[PDB]
């Protein structure tokens, strides 16, 4: 089967890498507001529905092409989504919106074994994001892979707390700690990037885009072979888990020092090594429209001893090297702006290995 | 689990019954043309995008309410889809269209065991038909049922043979025999009503709305527990199998005399009883916008010895009675016009019984 990946570190053979082409700023609706830094709120308000800065997008395209060249050199087969104009305005019976991009394969696709699963998403501007990936998925389907699409939400107003009392990121953190998110439990919704894989155990977090109904859907769909565990963090990332708790090997995880895990003892009891990466050196002046400076730890493992890491973030490169992990340095500084690092910009389709348990 | 149905005849405990409210004539696109009788082509051309005749719809509503009263009297729990205005025009990045209705639960939902599966559909006017059923499905999901949505097609032009050389129903039959349908194999598509259940064995037909990719998707998704077999018929019904080969008990099937099954010997070898129902007596003057006069055999089994059958079709009532099967006569003459009989207007959610093999 062309599709076969049970975790985040076995020898990578095939990967899907996203595109920066035609990326559009999403309209400033409540769920966008709840997943971005106040600093950028006026940018969303003014540029909503327009392309991201074209001079910036062009630099990202260049950086990503080079990343693909390096992947091919490292023996990895690269697939890319179809080019699409994300500015088209679509309309369902529940809402109207323009699209976002197909830059982050990790946000929408997740491979569990021989199965590729398309996440439902939770943003209105990402309702039709799966269209960029269908040519690839149908190809794998024709070659034997299982293909699943989690239930697509209506994304009607009921799925959101229109009046989410967030005036700043500190408020979101307080609300988050209270168990209050911009998304309700009206219907299942989730981004695939809120799940991180370790063989028979998958970890997920309830976030601004991934509700308990969405996690239960995954849990119920994957059982009995896979166990889905819910974990939480202090000052959690609004959406996605791969720049907070990035699992990099059998029993080894990178834990973001600013977002400590409440269930860290479960990992310590299992004898896992928790590594806290050095702080990011990315300029505070550099625009990160989504995500944060912690993209530095959003690494991609080519195998247990080869990591693709940012060329600029020397301190984390040095951490991997003292651990005997070969660093493959690639610069994606402008690509980061879109909200992702190496783990976000890819979706590992095939890794050489078997299904195993590491939590014991 | 509130959801549990392995076949078409075990004691029915819960059912979803469709609605005739706000039903809209679909625009006359190629796939509608390929699934209707020439006689009605000009009606689709003129009335496309408008409500079906309101005086006709009102009579159907009345007939269906009475059917529900009878179901409750027979001990069956009835659920209905949400009322929705099907006239809203929606737009995806591939096409624009108005909707159809939520009259036929059998066309979109199929229950296999404890799992409710939403079919992708193949008509543009039915892209958002699932919206009427989400309140019910989420309720069953909260109560323990598994819920699956087959991959929703883009329904881009590539899925259709825009130039399908059909000038009359005789042409469609000839093309059908040639293995040429209005739908291509561009992406998976299917209506749940092209599948009929008999425990571990499910039968499907490749039709104008159900392609081989769609059937393979079901086959791959249900294996190893269920086996999906493909069968074909002479002068097949354009879409849906339940008025051609309606399985009514362990090893007993109603076979439409005008559409004989090519693989009939597989059933005879298994010792199944094939019954050919008497001809329909429905007036040729009565409008059947979709389907045909064979709705008479589109019966619904309440259990092995209780069948819900049309009050007007006396000859088929007499056939069941000589077989010792109690006939529960209900008149749905105006409801038939929309394209369905009892099996079409319902989706059995819970039947009292176990998973078994009848093909041996």
UniProtKB/Swiss-Prot annotation, chains A, B:
What does the record give as the active site? 191, 240, 344 (amidino-cysteine intermediate)
InterPro entries per UniProt: AmidinoTrfase
Q: What is the effect of changing residue 170 to K?
A: Complete loss of activity
Record's keyword annotation contains Ubl conjugation:
no
Record note on what altering residue 266 to V does: In CCDS3; uncertain significance; decreases glycine amidinotransferase activity
- Outcome recorded upon mutating residue 145 to T: In CCDS3; uncertain significance; loss of glycine amidinotransferase activity
- Tissue expression from the record: Expressed in brain, heart, kidney, liver, lung, salivary gland and skeletal muscle tissue, with the highest expression in kidney. Biallelically expressed in placenta and fetal tissues.
Q: What is the effect of changing residue 39 to N?
A: In CCDS3; uncertain significance; reduces glycine amidinotransferase activity
Q: What is the effect of changing residue 107 to N?
A: Complete loss of activity
Q: In which pathway does it act?
A: Amine and polyamine biosynthesis; creatine biosynthesis; creatine from L-arginine and glycine: step 1/2
Q: Which residues are recorded as binding arginine?
A: 107, 242, 259, 291-292
Record note on what altering residue 259 to E does: Significantly reduced activity
* Keyword S-adenosyl-L-methionine set for record: no
Record's subunit section = Homodimer. There is an equilibrium between the monomeric and dimeric forms, shifted towards the side of the monomer.
Provide the function of this protein: Transamidinase that catalyzes the transfer of the amidino group of L-arginine onto the amino moiety of acceptor metabolites such as glycine, beta-alanine, gamma-aminobutyric acid (GABA) and taurine yielding the corresponding guanidine derivatives. Catalyzes the rate-limiting step of creatine biosynthesis, namely the transfer of the amidino group from L-arginine to glycine to generate guanidinoacetate, which is then methylated by GAMT to form creatine. Provides creatine as a source for ATP generation in tissues with high energy demands, in particular skeletal muscle, heart and brain.
Q: Give the family from UniProt.
A: Belongs to the amidinotransferase family.
Give the disease association. Cerebral creatine deficiency syndrome 3: An autosomal recessive disorder characterized by developmental delay/regression, intellectual disability, severe disturbance of expressive and cognitive speech, and severe depletion of creatine/phosphocreatine in the brain. Most patients develop a myopathy characterized by muscle weakness and atrophy later in life. Fanconi renotubular syndrome 1: A form of Fanconi renotubular syndrome, a disease due to a generalized dysfunction of the proximal kidney tubule resulting in decreased solute and water reabsorption. Patients have polydipsia and polyuria with phosphaturia, glycosuria and aminoaciduria. They may develop hypophosphatemic rickets or osteomalacia, acidosis and a tendency toward dehydration. Some eventually develop renal insufficiency. FRTS1 inheritance is autosomal dominant.
Q: What is known of its domains?
A: One chain folds into a compact single domain composed of repeating units, five beta-beta-alpha-beta modules, which surround the central active site.
The protein here is known as: Glycine amidinotransferase, mitochondrial
Q: Which organism is it from?
A: Homo sapiens (Human)
Task: State the organism's lineage.
Answer: Eukaryota, Metazoa, Chordata, Craniata, Vertebrata
